[PDB]
């Protein structure tokens, strides 16, 4: 019985990693994720220049999940590139580097500089097309023409395999169109489903107030709220992109949740809200719990059940 | 202290009603809703001809909410129109009739016949632009040009005030556009936010199977999953449609949840999943609980806190 995977020309001890944005902004964070039992890690989505992000309070967690409007606070692309070039211990686990430039030009600028490091070190690009928290910037992948432009420009400028972080969709027509756009791009080797469910609103009944400051309280939702949404998107893209990998993200708190993501089609499984709340000790627990479910079912490897969800 | 209110030239004993689709398909259901302590009722979304709907199982409930792909099973518009014209006791409470034709032409045909009954009896139209469960028919209100066409043609054919059942949105640009489309039509006096969060997927770990049969298990989500999304949409439309009413729907299980919807801007509060699971006794409990929160806070009227959610 084993959780090992071999994909994108890298070997992973198990399918778990942080979700971008959680425990991955500073060198301290990345060293922590590296020391954890996770199979991989991804750095904070970055911009060309450092950013302070949105005003605080900008994250709050509750029993059923979290809301945030961080606003892409990050140490800047130079930092994450240097981390990937000089600092990361690749003998420990593979590293993904997430970028979220505020325009196609900014993304293109960054990937031109990332390319030689990706060639040399094997760092893997996750292009974030789904940030719902920057005031005035709608989610790129909710505009299919813009999505195509970004992917055309990034494919041309980068020229290496990469992946895309996708927003959740809620309409079969959108699954069909989105997956078809992705299928136009052979360098897109993995699709991460999903980013936060955008622009939710938590209100505290006692204070009669929204709980985060940016955007009049409107922020991305994660955690228990989003699991069925996340599984639907994982499965929709798994079915529609048979020549790509799908990484699952959304609502994972237990090895059972990870098991459902894998049944739905997930290769790697990312942990956001639960990791933010529990800390990196979560990775040993999710590993044990997934192996227990596999043991009980007689599954010896992940491939034995990946994408094997039954329909009626 | 009582929760009585006036809206749309009708008087309501309290802001509570069923959500369309729940406990409202047959004469028996409608008689049951009428005998309940709800302030109003709405009939099942209907089509010109009766429909058997999607294959069973097609509804499932869980601690955090529900998933369904009913597929508009209904007794046909002739039945709901007859209920409105001949059978409903308007001395008990107001009635909303929901229609969900599968084309603009179908909706136009229905509203032309509804008009004389609305003139005589005061039945209120809720035009459903957000059914996410009929195979091959995308949610109308996710296509803004289609949404405009439907509202143009219905406004012209019907000529009387009406309301619209909206899908949830997740992008500030979409809130802006959707509300601007709605604001083009002075006959649209109310906006119901929200219909189900479309096309989620629930998977049972033990059986390794989806839990509903239609559309490979993909169905609309309601219940605790969707409360922050519901509140966001209620508030977004409340802010952008100052000259219309917003009815809140999504995630109501308690007087506290109703209190939050009303703080976000809700005039009426609809109850779907919780009503499906608890039954019509829920309305007395919700009234008691809302009155208790109001008393504790020193509020004597709904108008005192409606839309008064505080930002930071
Ligand atoms: C604190 C916070 C910051 C995040 N920052 C990013 C980000 O930088 N890039 C990104 O793609 N997603 C970001 N996310 C979204 C997560 O990666 C993930 O998609 C989302 O939280 C859903 O997963 P969950 O249900 O496990 O939380 C962030 C989420 C939160 C909670
Ligand atoms: C069994 C089922 C049937 C529904 N049928 C309709 C329908 O006919 N028309 C409609 O506008 N909404 C329908 N809905 C969606 C609800 O009206 C409501 O918008 C949704 O369930 C979210 O509210 P909730 O969280 O209280 O469940 C239905 C929901 C369920 C649970
Ligand atoms: O930093 C943030 O606001 C989150 C971005 C994201 O969810 O992509
Ligand atoms: O009958 C249904 O499938 C539900 C429709 C809706 O949510 O509008």
XYZ file of C-alpha atoms and ligand atoms in Angstrom:
702
model
C 0.000 0.000 0.000
C 1.374 3.357 -1.045
C 0.548 6.945 -1.780
C 3.473 7.449 -4.218
C 2.838 9.235 -7.517
C 5.043 9.880 -10.523
C 3.778 12.722 -12.729
C 5.066 15.709 -14.691
C 8.555 14.016 -14.594
C 8.689 14.264 -10.777
C 8.230 11.779 -7.980
C 5.883 12.586 -5.106
C 5.833 10.725 -1.775
C 2.078 11.302 -1.462
C -0.530 13.470 -3.212
C -0.843 16.213 -0.543
C 0.412 19.767 -0.755
C -0.629 23.192 0.493
C -3.070 25.250 -1.549
C -1.384 28.356 -2.968
C -1.612 31.241 -0.543
C -1.585 29.157 2.642
C 1.740 28.722 4.558
C 3.903 29.742 1.585
C 4.600 33.459 1.545
C 7.920 33.932 3.380
C 11.093 31.849 3.355
C 10.101 30.688 6.858
C 6.721 29.428 5.500
C 8.340 27.607 2.575
C 10.933 25.956 4.845
C 8.069 24.859 7.107
C 6.113 23.336 4.204
C 9.351 21.667 3.046
C 9.940 20.104 6.513
C 6.319 18.852 6.666
C 5.098 15.449 5.458
C 3.420 16.949 2.348
C 4.275 15.439 -1.032
C 4.920 18.883 -2.563
C 4.482 22.616 -1.915
C 3.433 25.671 -3.920
C 4.580 29.257 -3.263
C 2.229 32.232 -2.730
C 0.801 33.640 -5.990
C 3.145 36.514 -6.762
C 3.279 39.734 -8.752
C 6.329 41.419 -10.365
C 6.604 43.855 -7.488
C 6.026 43.109 -3.774
C 2.476 43.873 -2.489
C 1.132 44.712 0.997
C -2.283 43.292 0.015
C -5.754 44.443 1.183
C -6.415 46.095 4.610
C -6.901 43.887 7.724
C -8.910 42.031 8.985
C -8.761 40.114 5.691
C -9.109 36.426 6.681
C -11.555 34.783 9.130
C -12.301 31.129 9.776
C -15.449 29.520 11.162
C -16.685 25.978 11.774
C -17.768 25.519 8.113
C -14.826 27.246 6.495
C -13.087 30.527 5.765
C -13.561 33.836 3.991
C -10.641 35.970 2.775
C -9.745 39.009 0.747
C -5.983 38.947 1.098
C -5.358 40.958 -2.108
C -2.247 39.048 -3.219
C 0.108 40.181 -0.455
C 3.474 38.726 -1.497
C 7.253 39.275 -1.356
C 7.408 39.803 -5.131
C 8.489 37.613 -8.034
C 12.268 38.193 -7.502
C 11.953 36.575 -4.087
C 10.016 33.463 -5.227
C 12.320 33.022 -8.219
C 15.374 33.186 -5.917
C 13.688 30.744 -3.573
C 13.257 28.303 -6.498
C 16.789 28.947 -7.864
C 18.949 28.947 -4.797
C 17.058 28.026 -1.659
C 14.681 25.125 -2.249
C 15.823 21.655 -1.350
C 14.551 19.616 -4.302
C 15.803 16.373 -2.674
C 12.999 16.876 -0.139
C 10.007 17.408 -2.456
C 8.962 19.082 -5.743
C 8.168 22.767 -5.784
C 5.425 24.623 -7.704
C 5.658 28.365 -8.153
C 2.360 30.229 -8.540
C 2.095 33.528 -10.397
C -0.824 35.919 -10.524
C 0.212 39.028 -12.461
C -2.510 41.686 -12.758
C -2.357 41.721 -16.592
C -1.221 39.438 -19.381
C 1.896 41.597 -19.810
C 2.880 41.145 -16.179
C 2.457 37.358 -16.401
C 4.459 37.215 -19.630
C 7.265 39.300 -18.012
C 7.521 36.808 -15.115
C 7.393 33.570 -17.099
C 10.215 34.751 -19.444
C 12.453 34.937 -16.334
C 11.090 31.757 -14.775
C 11.747 29.603 -17.857
C 15.516 29.076 -17.423
C 15.050 28.253 -13.696
C 12.300 25.752 -14.570
C 14.691 24.182 -17.101
C 17.587 24.046 -14.646
C 15.786 23.193 -11.340
C 12.531 21.590 -12.414
C 10.313 24.085 -10.544
C 6.737 23.781 -11.927
C 4.578 26.816 -12.924
C 0.986 27.204 -11.669
C -0.622 30.131 -13.518
C -3.369 31.634 -11.336
C -6.313 32.692 -13.503
C -8.847 32.934 -10.693
C -7.908 35.530 -8.015
C -11.289 36.907 -6.796
C -9.923 39.467 -4.312
C -8.154 42.340 -6.115
C -10.503 45.341 -6.335
C -11.305 46.105 -9.984
C -9.825 42.857 -11.396
C -12.507 40.182 -12.174
C -11.394 36.517 -12.333
C -9.570 36.080 -15.661
C -11.040 32.611 -16.322
C -14.621 33.951 -16.074
C -13.868 35.697 -19.381
C -13.089 32.960 -21.886
C -11.577 35.336 -24.459
C -9.193 36.795 -21.860
C -8.432 33.259 -20.675
C -7.434 32.243 -24.197
C -5.230 35.383 -24.548
C -3.402 34.721 -21.289
C -2.805 31.092 -22.230
C -1.652 31.974 -25.769
C 0.772 34.595 -24.515
C 2.095 32.538 -21.605
C 2.535 29.362 -23.745
C 4.525 31.372 -26.307
C 6.684 33.218 -23.782
C 7.253 30.244 -21.464
C 7.428 27.284 -23.875
C 7.513 24.713 -21.067
C 4.824 22.516 -19.384
C 2.741 24.426 -16.844
C -0.570 24.301 -15.011
C -3.508 26.603 -14.430
C -5.435 27.417 -11.220
C -9.128 27.631 -12.203
C -12.128 29.318 -10.548
C -15.167 27.179 -9.815
C -17.934 27.093 -12.451
C -21.615 26.367 -11.838
C -23.048 25.755 -15.316
C -22.450 22.773 -17.666
C -21.992 25.194 -20.611
C -19.099 26.844 -18.702
C -17.436 23.482 -17.943
C -17.682 22.659 -21.701
C -16.253 26.019 -22.915
C -13.531 26.297 -20.227
C -12.198 22.754 -20.798
C -12.231 23.311 -24.583
C -10.153 26.502 -24.163
C -7.667 24.542 -21.999
C -7.565 21.746 -24.567
C -6.249 24.220 -27.190
C -3.000 24.446 -25.209
C -0.720 21.369 -25.184
C 1.719 22.971 -22.691
C -1.068 23.085 -20.076
C -0.350 19.777 -18.378
C -2.366 20.175 -15.211
C -5.527 21.959 -14.125
C -6.064 22.842 -10.453
C -9.742 22.902 -9.472
C -10.659 25.030 -7.580
C -9.786 28.518 -6.288
C -12.102 30.064 -3.677
C -15.805 30.381 -4.400
C -15.661 34.110 -5.147
C -17.310 37.057 -3.440
C -19.200 35.355 -0.580
C -20.292 37.464 2.426
C -20.095 36.403 6.045
C -22.050 38.513 8.528
C -21.679 38.301 12.315
C -25.183 38.364 13.848
C -24.027 39.810 17.213
C -22.160 42.856 15.836
C -24.400 43.063 12.729
C -21.170 43.498 10.805
C -19.299 41.911 7.914
C -16.142 40.124 9.249
C -13.532 41.268 6.735
C -12.634 44.847 5.822
C -11.836 44.810 2.059
C -14.585 45.208 -0.537
C -17.433 45.844 1.995
C -16.903 42.346 3.383
C -17.001 40.362 0.091
C -14.366 37.584 -0.087
C -13.427 34.136 -1.373
C -14.939 31.147 0.461
C -13.079 27.946 1.244
C -13.503 24.970 3.549
C -16.573 22.808 4.181
C -18.778 25.210 2.239
C -17.124 24.363 -1.053
C -16.473 20.614 -1.144
C -19.354 19.548 -3.451
C -18.488 22.543 -5.734
C -14.820 21.505 -5.752
C -15.591 17.820 -6.483
C -17.892 18.795 -9.355
C -15.206 20.940 -10.952
C -12.490 18.302 -10.454
C -14.703 15.675 -12.107
C -15.929 17.998 -14.866
C -12.368 18.765 -15.985
C -11.158 15.212 -15.441
C -13.855 14.017 -17.830
C -13.310 16.857 -20.318
C -9.445 16.951 -20.306
C -8.444 13.291 -20.696
C -4.913 14.266 -21.843
C -4.202 16.537 -18.823
C -3.879 16.006 -15.071
C -6.345 17.520 -12.616
C -5.206 18.626 -9.132
C -8.027 18.880 -6.589
C -8.405 21.735 -4.151
C -11.411 22.738 -1.989
C -12.899 21.427 1.260
C -10.242 18.841 2.174
C -10.167 18.306 5.979
C -9.785 14.499 6.165
C -8.376 11.542 4.272
C -12.010 10.796 3.358
C -12.346 14.220 1.623
C -9.052 13.523 -0.224
C -10.419 10.097 -1.157
C -13.505 11.751 -2.716
C -11.291 14.203 -4.644
C -9.199 11.289 -5.976
C -12.340 9.319 -6.947
C -13.431 12.456 -8.826
C -10.162 12.474 -10.768
C -7.598 14.326 -8.654
C -3.886 13.579 -8.961
C -2.479 15.943 -6.348
C -4.755 17.085 -3.504
C -4.296 20.598 -2.117
C -5.245 21.725 1.388
C -6.072 25.389 2.048
C -8.442 26.388 4.882
C -7.887 23.168 6.913
C -4.096 23.734 6.714
C -4.441 27.400 7.683
C -6.461 26.323 10.728
C -4.715 23.096 11.796
C -1.094 23.750 10.742
C 1.309 21.450 8.829
C 0.750 18.526 11.225
C -2.414 17.979 9.118
C -0.306 16.197 6.443
C 0.592 13.196 8.602
C -3.087 12.876 9.648
C -4.429 13.041 6.054
C -1.844 10.450 4.999
C -2.841 8.037 7.792
C -6.540 8.549 7.166
C -6.265 8.027 3.388
C -4.218 4.830 3.885
C -6.833 3.571 6.380
C -9.640 4.036 3.844
C -7.541 2.328 1.131
C -6.706 -0.553 3.470
C -10.387 -1.090 4.315
C -11.281 -1.080 0.613
C -8.358 -3.227 -0.543
C -6.792 -0.470 -2.687
C -3.009 -0.672 -2.878
C -2.280 2.372 -5.074
C -3.949 5.699 -5.979
C -4.312 4.692 -9.673
C -6.578 1.844 -8.573
C -9.375 4.272 -7.755
C -8.451 7.656 -9.328
C -11.347 8.950 -11.478
C -13.374 5.793 -10.734
C -16.382 7.540 -9.175
C -19.517 5.591 -10.094
C -22.600 7.098 -11.669
C -26.129 5.643 -11.359
C -44.522 42.768 18.837
C -45.405 41.096 15.511
C -43.525 40.637 12.210
C -46.346 41.993 9.983
C -45.315 43.875 6.769
C -46.635 45.376 3.469
C -44.923 44.913 0.072
C -46.053 44.925 -3.580
C -49.551 46.127 -2.528
C -50.057 43.059 -0.327
C -49.968 42.570 3.400
C -47.859 39.758 4.845
C -48.099 38.358 8.421
C -44.339 37.760 8.500
C -41.451 37.716 5.998
C -41.310 33.876 5.676
C -42.322 31.695 2.693
C -41.262 28.444 1.058
C -38.642 28.552 -1.653
C -40.113 27.654 -5.068
C -39.947 23.888 -5.688
C -40.290 22.891 -2.020
C -43.703 21.763 -0.695
C -45.590 23.384 -3.579
C -46.086 21.046 -6.492
C -49.613 19.568 -5.849
C -52.909 20.955 -4.553
C -52.151 19.058 -1.327
C -48.745 20.741 -0.970
C -50.190 24.168 -1.671
C -53.019 23.621 0.838
C -50.381 22.583 3.392
C -48.264 25.736 2.766
C -51.462 27.837 3.027
C -52.354 26.237 6.403
C -48.807 26.825 7.746
C -47.813 29.971 9.620
C -45.730 31.239 6.637
C -46.379 34.819 5.534
C -46.805 33.714 1.911
C -46.288 30.799 -0.491
C -44.914 30.253 -3.983
C -45.959 27.478 -6.360
C -43.585 25.013 -8.064
C -41.853 26.455 -11.172
C -44.052 25.323 -14.018
C -43.937 24.734 -17.751
C -46.719 24.863 -20.384
C -47.156 21.083 -20.335
C -46.917 18.759 -17.312
C -43.445 17.202 -16.776
C -42.259 14.000 -15.028
C -38.829 15.601 -14.515
C -35.449 13.881 -14.213
C -34.882 10.151 -13.203
C -34.846 9.206 -9.493
C -33.051 9.377 -7.117
C -32.930 13.124 -7.724
C -32.896 14.784 -4.275
C -30.583 13.955 -1.350
C -30.087 15.730 1.997
C -27.009 15.793 4.260
C -26.097 17.590 7.541
C -24.754 20.563 5.582
C -27.485 20.806 2.944
C -28.926 19.221 -0.146
C -28.279 18.393 -3.786
C -30.990 17.934 -6.377
C -31.619 17.541 -10.025
C -35.430 17.510 -10.045
C -35.673 18.640 -13.703
C -38.851 20.739 -13.268
C -41.339 17.974 -12.492
C -44.668 19.829 -12.285
C -48.413 19.460 -12.945
C -48.358 21.962 -15.808
C -49.177 25.646 -15.997
C -52.948 24.959 -16.447
C -52.954 23.444 -12.942
C -51.034 26.253 -11.153
C -53.081 28.921 -12.970
C -56.307 27.171 -11.832
C -54.964 26.992 -8.284
C -54.348 30.767 -8.419
C -57.642 31.675 -10.070
C -60.067 29.271 -8.338
C -58.545 27.412 -5.398
C -56.258 29.697 -3.395
C -57.668 31.442 -0.317
C -56.150 34.914 -0.613
C -57.624 35.828 2.793
C -54.999 33.487 4.348
C -51.869 34.873 2.612
C -50.528 36.120 -0.743
C -49.536 33.714 -3.492
C -46.599 33.850 -5.893
C -46.720 31.740 -9.031
C -43.291 30.669 -10.369
C -42.867 29.942 -14.077
C -39.819 28.349 -15.708
C -40.452 27.882 -19.438
C -37.614 26.292 -21.414
C -37.617 29.134 -23.996
C -38.624 32.798 -24.098
C -41.587 31.793 -26.280
C -42.832 29.371 -23.612
C -42.607 32.022 -20.845
C -44.414 34.577 -23.015
C -47.284 32.080 -23.641
C -47.682 31.515 -19.914
C -47.551 35.165 -18.795
C -50.176 36.172 -21.403
C -52.613 33.811 -19.627
C -51.430 34.667 -16.112
C -52.111 38.389 -16.671
C -55.945 38.365 -16.341
C -55.663 36.202 -13.184
C -53.067 38.639 -11.745
C -55.513 41.513 -12.554
C -58.424 39.724 -10.885
C -56.788 37.916 -7.945
C -53.477 39.687 -7.285
C -51.317 36.524 -7.697
C -47.654 37.573 -8.088
C -45.318 36.334 -10.830
C -41.800 35.043 -10.072
C -39.999 34.443 -13.395
C -37.385 31.714 -12.895
C -34.189 32.599 -14.809
C -31.973 30.175 -12.986
C -33.020 26.513 -13.291
C -29.707 24.598 -13.264
C -31.045 21.004 -13.719
C -32.655 20.568 -17.179
C -30.203 18.705 -19.473
C -28.925 20.942 -22.273
C -30.563 24.137 -20.909
C -27.989 26.516 -19.285
C -29.127 28.982 -16.588
C -30.674 31.890 -18.536
C -29.366 34.576 -16.216
C -25.746 33.524 -16.829
C -26.197 34.779 -20.406
C -26.896 38.542 -20.076
C -28.157 39.006 -23.625
C -30.569 36.064 -23.128
C -31.613 37.534 -19.756
C -32.377 40.916 -21.406
C -34.382 39.200 -24.194
C -36.483 37.246 -21.683
C -37.215 40.347 -19.563
C -38.019 42.495 -22.646
C -40.448 39.903 -24.018
C -42.042 39.052 -20.646
C -42.417 42.737 -19.682
C -44.167 43.407 -23.010
C -46.431 40.319 -22.882
C -47.356 40.587 -19.211
C -47.496 44.376 -18.577
C -47.824 43.952 -14.812
C -45.301 44.022 -11.925
C -43.288 40.831 -11.480
C -40.166 39.372 -9.896
C -37.174 37.336 -11.007
C -35.508 34.290 -9.365
C -31.739 34.826 -9.913
C -28.790 32.403 -9.942
C -25.920 33.128 -7.613
C -23.028 35.154 -9.007
C -19.404 35.048 -7.792
C -17.735 38.014 -9.561
C -18.212 41.723 -8.867
C -18.338 42.458 -12.632
C -21.304 40.054 -12.889
C -23.163 41.683 -10.011
C -22.678 45.046 -11.777
C -23.905 43.727 -15.150
C -26.748 41.581 -13.834
C -28.135 44.430 -11.721
C -27.822 46.912 -14.621
C -29.795 44.491 -16.826
C -32.508 44.213 -14.131
C -32.621 47.984 -13.674
C -33.601 48.345 -17.368
C -37.063 46.909 -16.494
C -39.351 48.961 -14.226
C -41.863 46.092 -14.113
C -39.335 43.945 -12.220
C -40.334 44.958 -8.683
C -38.504 42.186 -6.797
C -35.397 40.054 -7.183
C -35.054 36.674 -5.438
C -31.427 35.777 -4.601
C -30.610 32.945 -4.872
C -31.545 29.770 -6.707
C -29.298 26.725 -6.014
C -25.548 26.852 -6.416
C -25.554 24.999 -9.720
C -23.896 21.757 -10.671
C -22.210 20.618 -7.477
C -21.349 16.929 -7.043
C -21.824 14.877 -3.905
C -19.997 11.552 -3.719
C -20.582 8.815 -1.135
C -17.263 7.503 0.129
C -18.579 4.054 1.121
C -20.284 3.245 -2.219
C -17.778 5.308 -4.311
C -20.807 6.607 -6.166
C -22.563 9.898 -6.877
C -25.852 10.176 -4.915
C -28.247 11.411 -7.567
C -28.937 9.768 -10.932
C -29.458 12.613 -13.410
C -26.559 14.352 -15.212
C -23.878 11.941 -13.850
C -24.635 13.149 -10.297
C -24.306 16.920 -10.973
C -27.042 18.896 -9.190
C -28.037 22.182 -7.515
C -26.778 22.822 -3.952
C -28.820 24.356 -1.121
C -28.608 24.472 2.676
C -25.730 25.400 4.980
C -23.254 25.159 2.048
C -24.654 28.274 0.417
C -25.437 30.796 3.165
C -22.410 33.115 2.623
C -23.042 33.003 -1.170
C -26.758 33.764 -0.630
C -26.025 36.704 1.710
C -23.495 38.147 -0.764
C -25.979 38.041 -3.621
C -28.831 39.510 -1.517
C -26.564 42.355 -0.448
C -25.060 42.917 -3.904
C -28.511 43.335 -5.487
C -29.847 45.296 -2.522
C -27.025 47.818 -3.023
C -27.341 47.938 -6.829
C -31.169 47.930 -7.145
C -32.268 50.729 -4.752
C -35.677 50.938 -6.461
C -36.519 47.196 -6.272
C -37.125 44.673 -3.463
C -34.705 41.821 -2.787
C -36.099 38.510 -1.466
C -33.467 36.389 0.233
C -33.221 32.642 -0.300
C -30.396 30.279 0.592
C -29.187 28.585 3.748
C -32.010 29.624 6.132
C -32.376 27.162 9.059
C -32.941 29.552 11.967
C -34.304 32.966 12.945
C -30.639 34.019 13.146
C -30.028 33.035 9.484
C -33.197 35.006 8.556
C -31.898 37.934 10.614
C -28.680 37.895 8.557
C -30.616 37.800 5.220
C -32.693 40.784 6.415
C -29.571 42.684 7.546
C -28.162 42.040 4.049
C -31.312 43.621 2.605
C -33.986 40.926 2.299
C -37.651 41.925 2.345
C -39.064 38.372 2.264
C -37.020 35.300 3.316
C -37.540 32.011 1.531
C -36.816 28.597 3.031
C -35.966 25.637 0.818
C -33.743 22.773 2.084
C -34.580 23.376 5.791
C -38.307 23.266 4.978
C -37.873 20.124 2.859
C -36.161 18.457 5.794
C -38.084 19.822 8.814
C -41.550 20.321 7.307
C -43.943 23.319 7.679
C -43.654 23.486 11.502
C -40.353 25.286 10.754
C -42.279 28.512 10.107
C -43.485 28.849 13.716
C -39.960 28.183 15.002
C -38.392 30.703 12.579
C -40.898 33.399 13.620
C -40.268 32.734 17.340
C -36.498 32.793 16.855
C -36.464 35.996 14.749
C -38.734 37.766 17.272
C -36.438 36.686 20.087
C -33.312 38.090 18.357
C -35.166 41.358 17.634
C -36.288 41.666 21.288
C -32.796 40.994 22.656
C -31.371 43.685 20.330
C -34.189 46.212 20.941
C -35.530 46.185 17.395
C -39.322 46.669 17.088
C -39.617 46.464 13.275
C -37.871 44.799 10.323
C -37.409 48.203 8.722
C -35.137 49.184 11.633
C -32.376 46.806 10.499
C -33.185 45.815 6.902
C -30.083 46.366 4.753
C -28.195 47.858 7.695
C -25.314 45.362 7.724
C -22.257 47.294 8.959
C -18.992 47.392 7.004
C -15.533 47.935 8.567
C -5.499 32.765 3.107
C -5.900 32.514 1.676
C -4.973 32.917 0.690
C -5.029 32.364 -0.578
N -4.122 32.759 -1.554
C -4.154 32.155 -2.798
C -3.228 32.474 -3.775
O -2.274 33.209 -3.493
N -3.294 31.850 -5.007
C -4.262 30.901 -5.259
O -4.328 30.333 -6.343
N -5.188 30.609 -4.297
C -5.131 31.202 -3.072
N -6.053 30.836 -2.113
C -7.125 29.878 -2.491
C -6.674 28.489 -2.060
O -5.521 28.173 -2.795
C -7.764 27.460 -2.357
O -8.028 27.453 -3.736
C -9.064 27.772 -1.619
O -8.759 28.121 -0.278
C -10.028 26.574 -1.619
O -9.454 25.495 -0.896
P -9.844 25.144 0.623
O -11.311 24.781 0.598
O -8.999 23.999 1.048
O -9.541 26.358 1.455
C -6.005 31.399 -0.861
C -6.909 30.985 0.119
C -6.881 31.556 1.382
C -7.673 30.819 2.446
C -36.332 19.936 -4.156
C -35.851 21.229 -4.779
C -36.645 21.766 -5.807
C -36.522 23.097 -6.181
N -37.314 23.583 -7.204
C -37.236 24.910 -7.568
C -38.105 25.400 -8.542
O -39.057 24.697 -8.981
N -37.977 26.727 -8.875
C -37.023 27.547 -8.280
O -36.950 28.747 -8.589
N -36.180 27.048 -7.316
C -36.279 25.736 -6.942
N -35.426 25.214 -5.968
C -34.296 26.037 -5.421
C -34.869 26.711 -4.171
O -35.973 27.495 -4.536
C -33.836 27.566 -3.450
O -33.506 28.660 -4.302
C -32.581 26.721 -3.125
O -32.939 25.456 -2.583
C -31.651 27.417 -2.135
O -32.332 27.681 -0.930
P -32.069 26.759 0.371
O -30.650 26.900 0.780
O -33.040 27.165 1.445
O -32.266 25.325 -0.048
C -35.579 23.913 -5.551
C -34.779 23.382 -4.532
C -34.909 22.040 -4.140
C -34.328 21.655 -2.794
O -4.312 36.622 -2.220
C -5.543 36.529 -2.436
O -6.347 37.476 -2.280
C -6.143 35.266 -2.918
C -5.940 34.948 -4.194
C -6.541 33.738 -4.775
O -7.461 33.116 -4.147
O -6.119 33.410 -5.904
O -36.885 21.511 -10.808
C -35.674 21.741 -10.667
O -34.806 20.983 -11.152
C -35.176 22.917 -9.907
C -35.154 24.071 -10.567
C -34.639 25.321 -9.969
O -33.796 25.313 -9.029
O -35.028 26.367 -10.489
